[PDB]
Amino acid sequence: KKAIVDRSKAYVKLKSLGKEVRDAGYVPETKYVLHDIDEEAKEKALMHHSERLAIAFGIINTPPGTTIRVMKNLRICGDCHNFIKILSSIEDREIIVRDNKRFHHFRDGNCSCGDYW
């Protein structure tokens, strides 16, 4: 209930981050979203990938510059990998996403996996 409030705050930050990461050169690859829905809804479906929501929550919940550490039991999709790389170029935080195979260390617009995962 109050946890729904934490989610709400993450979705709000995500919208903000979405605009800035777009300004930084992120272009959402919506050809991936296999639903008979409009382009805006497809872009929202990608923005709402849970690793983005968890990163947005980490950013509002921690002091500026704090390393963000997110764990996802599933592989990070190509679109999230691009989004988080670009976010790491404009947010002065190390962002670490642990997926099913590795620790993706996003720093300064690069990932430690070299985009091969």
In the chain, the amino acid numbered 27 is V
What's the closest the beta carbon of residue 90 comes to Zn ion, in angstroms? 17
Nearest CB to Zn ion, comparing residues 5 and 98 = 98
Select from 9-17, 23-31, 59-67, 96-104 the region that touches Zn ion (CB under 5 A).
Answer: 96-104
Q: Could you tell me the smallest distance in angstroms from the CB atom of residue 55 to Zn ion?
A: 11
Cβ closest to Zn ion, residue 77 vs residue 90: 77
Nearer to Zn ion, 5 or 15 (CB): 15
How far from 55 is each of 3, 38, 74, CA to CA, in Å? 16, 26, 16
Q: Is 113 in the site for Zn ion (CB under 5 A)?
A: yes
In the complex, minimum distance from the CB of residue 101 to Zn ion, in angstroms, rounded to a whole number: 10
**Stretch 46-85 residues interacting with Zn ion (CB under 5 A):** 49, 77, 80
Residues lying near Zn ion in the complex (CB under 5 A): 49, 77, 80, 104, 111, 113
